[PDB]
Amino acid sequence: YFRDNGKHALIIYDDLSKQAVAYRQMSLLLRRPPGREAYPGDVFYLHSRLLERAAKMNDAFGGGSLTALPVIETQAGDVSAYIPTNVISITDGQIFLETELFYKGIRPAINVGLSVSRVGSAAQTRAM
Amino acid sequence: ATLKDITRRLKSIKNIQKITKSMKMVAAAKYARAERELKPARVYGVGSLALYEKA
Amino acid sequence: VRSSAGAVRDAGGAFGKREQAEEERYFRARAKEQLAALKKHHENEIS
């Protein structure tokens, strides 16, 4: 609504790894056949159709925007898991938080080595 | 960890073990040579110290 | 299960980072030396 009415919005799904679990429970109780790790087949779609709504409308469509900051939770840093990889291949950037950095004193634990942002140059003030 | 983590760690440790075995062999050869060359130098140096402990 | 060349830096454990640093420090030193020599040659070859 906000992005369609020329305003700007920010949405923070927290977590998406629990929406995936709720969807899996629904799908298993409707008797739909399971998939990998018991998640339904349509588990990528579930998220891709959801994170694709965070657009940046041009000035003809109001100019409004909707940023999204999905939050995923990995297991012992296994970024290679199923839902983490799906959402990593869906989103633009990433912000890797690591426990080894959290306890080494670096807080926020952002792992600047791996953290990425496709926009990069653009969307940054000239001084910064 | 997962299977790939364990596989990579196992391969790395195997390489490390190979390298340390090779280095042990090299060090043993160099040690044998060093002992062989140390005997005469042992007598020579002990002689050179002779004076101070005698006077 | 076997082992292959260049596996210590594929795991990326402690030995991988240790080796990467042991390489980078040495080659930074040699690059500094070579750059100094390059500057000296530049100056000595102007004439």
UniProtKB/Swiss-Prot annotation, chain A:
Residues annotated as site: Required for activity: 115
GO biological process, one term: proton motive force-driven ATP synthesis
PTM notes: Acetylated on lysine residues. BLOC1S1 is required for acetylation.
Keyword Phosphoprotein: yes
Entry binding sites for Mg(2+): 14
One cellular component (GO) term of this entry: plasma membrane
Additional notes on this entry: The siderophore enterobactin (Ent) produced by enteric bacteria binds Fe(3+) and helps bacteria scavenge iron ions from the environment. As a consequence, the mammalian siderocalin LCN2 plays an important role in defense against bacterial infections by sequestering iron bound to microbial siderophores. LCN2 can also bind iron bound to endogenous or nutrient-derived iron chelators and plays an important role in cellular iron homeostasis.
Protein name: ATP synthase F(1) complex subunit alpha, mitochondrial
Species per Swiss-Prot/TrEMBL record: Bos taurus
Upper taxonomic lineage: Eukaryota, Metazoa, Chordata, Craniata, Vertebrata
Residues of the full protein shown: 299 to 426 of 553
From Swiss-Prot, chain B:
N6-succinyllysine PTM positions: 24
Compartment(s): Mitochondrion inner membrane
Modified residues (N6-acetyllysine): 14, 30
Subunit relationships: Component of the ATP synthase complex composed at least of ATP5F1A/subunit alpha, ATP5F1B/subunit beta, ATP5MC1/subunit c (homooctomer), MT-ATP6/subunit a, MT-ATP8/subunit 8, ATP5ME/subunit e, ATP5MF/subunit f, ATP5MG/subunit g, ATP5MK/subunit k, ATP5MJ/subunit j, ATP5F1C/subunit gamma, ATP5F1D/subunit delta, ATP5F1E/subunit epsilon, ATP5PF/subunit F6, ATP5PB/subunit b, ATP5PD/subunit d, ATP5PO/subunit OSCP.
Role of this protein: Subunit gamma, of the mitochondrial membrane ATP synthase complex (F(1)F(0) ATP synthase or Complex V) that produces ATP from ADP in the presence of a proton gradient across the membrane which is generated by electron transport complexes of the respiratory chain. ATP synthase complex consist of a soluble F(1) head domain - the catalytic core - and a membrane F(1) domain - the membrane proton channel. These two domains are linked by a central stalk rotating inside the F(1) region and a stationary peripheral stalk.
UniProt similarity note: Belongs to the ATPase gamma chain family.
Name assigned to this protein: ATP synthase F(1) complex subunit gamma, mitochondrial
Organism of derivation: Bos taurus (Bovine)
Source taxonomy: Eukaryota, Metazoa, Chordata, Craniata, Vertebrata
Encoding gene (name): ATP5F1C
From Swiss-Prot, chain C:
N-terminal inhibitory region as annotated region, ranges: 1-20
Site (Participates in pH sensing): 19, 42
Chain spans, region Disordered: 1-20
Outcome recorded upon mutating residue 15 to A: Strongly impairs F(1)F(o)-ATP synthase-binding
Effect on the protein of changing residue 25 to A: No effect on F(1)F(o)-ATP synthase-binding
Functional summary from the UniProt entry: Endogenous F(1)F(o)-ATPase inhibitor limiting ATP depletion when the mitochondrial membrane potential falls below a threshold and the F(1)F(o)-ATP synthase starts hydrolyzing ATP to pump protons out of the mitochondrial matrix. Required to avoid the consumption of cellular ATP when the F(1)F(o)-ATP synthase enzyme acts as an ATP hydrolase. Indirectly acts as a regulator of heme synthesis in erythroid tissues: regulates heme synthesis by modulating the mitochondrial pH and redox potential, allowing FECH to efficiently catalyze the incorporation of iron into protoporphyrin IX to produce heme.
Name of the featured protein: ATPase inhibitor, mitochondrial
Gene expressing this chain: ATP5IF1
Residue numbers of the full-length protein present here: 33 to 79 of 109
